[PDB]
Amino acid sequence: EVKLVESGGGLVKPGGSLKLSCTASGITFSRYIMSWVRQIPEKRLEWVASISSGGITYYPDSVKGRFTISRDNVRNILYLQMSSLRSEDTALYYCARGQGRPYWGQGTLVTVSSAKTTPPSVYPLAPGCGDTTGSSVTLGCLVKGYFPESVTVTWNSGSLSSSVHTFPALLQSGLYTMSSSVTVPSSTWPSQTVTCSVAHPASSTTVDKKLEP
Amino acid sequence: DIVMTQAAFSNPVTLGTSASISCRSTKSLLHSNGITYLYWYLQKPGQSPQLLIYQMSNLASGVPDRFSSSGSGTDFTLRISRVEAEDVGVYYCAQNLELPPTFGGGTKLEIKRADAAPTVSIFPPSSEQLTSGGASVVCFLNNFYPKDINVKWKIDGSERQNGVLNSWTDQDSKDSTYSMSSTLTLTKDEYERHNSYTCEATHKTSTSPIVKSFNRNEC
Structure with a gap:
């Protein structure tokens, strides 16, 4: 079996933090560039972060300085630490193994709300x-x-x-x-x-x- | 970055015929190793996104070979032979040549089929809702084609617009029709001042609207 599974989504107040995690059956995160992407209604899928196998991190301007991507190579867990959350960060968040045959999870919803x-x-x-x-x-x-x-x-x-x-x-x-x-x-x-x-x-x-x- | 551009809609196709979906990049997706890092995925109504093809020519697991991709330079086409009802949804192109990855805006595949009149059903408020002092009257206008339809509510023969909210489905994956729900919401007290509640559907399949009603005091 091969699947990616995101968790950690929920309601979070503006200005807050929230850490998403991604686990897998059959994908060893340390070996690949791993990413987070997010989907907002009727907007096109948006790349959020990547971390290379060697640990080089990459972010677009929409989240750079606020979101941090990291990986636990021992437990095989990928994280997205969201900080200073904003109303516009509300979306379905997916982890993704983007190179080779791309894989992504089922998604976890983050709702930035009071x-x-x-x-x-x-x-x-x-x-x-x-x-x-x-x-x-x-x-x-x-x-x-x-x-x-x-x-x-x-x-x-x-x-x-x-x-x-x-x-x-x-x-x-x-x-x-x-x-x-x-x-x-x-x-x-x-x-x-x-x-x-x-x-x-x-x-x-x-x-x-x-x-x- | 590389910008990936598609039309939001293709022309509607008849079941059993071929469809094409076009995608443009600003830049070539062909790498020096001879591989074109184009991939396609589908998002069907009410499901999660499904990989179709990657590296231009590799089918994903479960994907039938009536799906194919070809192209060169900035210009690619996804071809779907023998289109099936279940193929409806939004098809996206994307590239993973570069970091960051970039994604197209999607093209909705629309199926052309025979006209179908709506099946109209009206429902009174549940006893449960009324006990809480609310009263929603619901009407379904189901399995019609084409997508254009009008709904009107009447309370004792007089048109009612206040408190009506409508929801429309995407094209059905099984029979390529459309449906709609219309809900009239009132307080229990308002509801209990009238007896006839009427939902009427106007669709191209007839000059006369399809009318369903119930009477609160009939039984």
């Missing part, structure tokens, strides 16, 4: 009372009032993936709201149950909602 985390309220979306029609029925879950992104909604433990729509979150007065829909045969709903499970990792919450109940 705000605190807020878990979502999760509400089921089911048809109103009345006569039925149709061979398919569409159900949903409304995931309201959370901060920061992201949430994941899973239907019947992943068993309904093909039929699902995930609606991009919207930000209003510091809180996000998103929804997810699924379409299933009417022959077996509501006779059988459907459940949405909503994970919001930032607040460490997972909530399940059953859709008839």
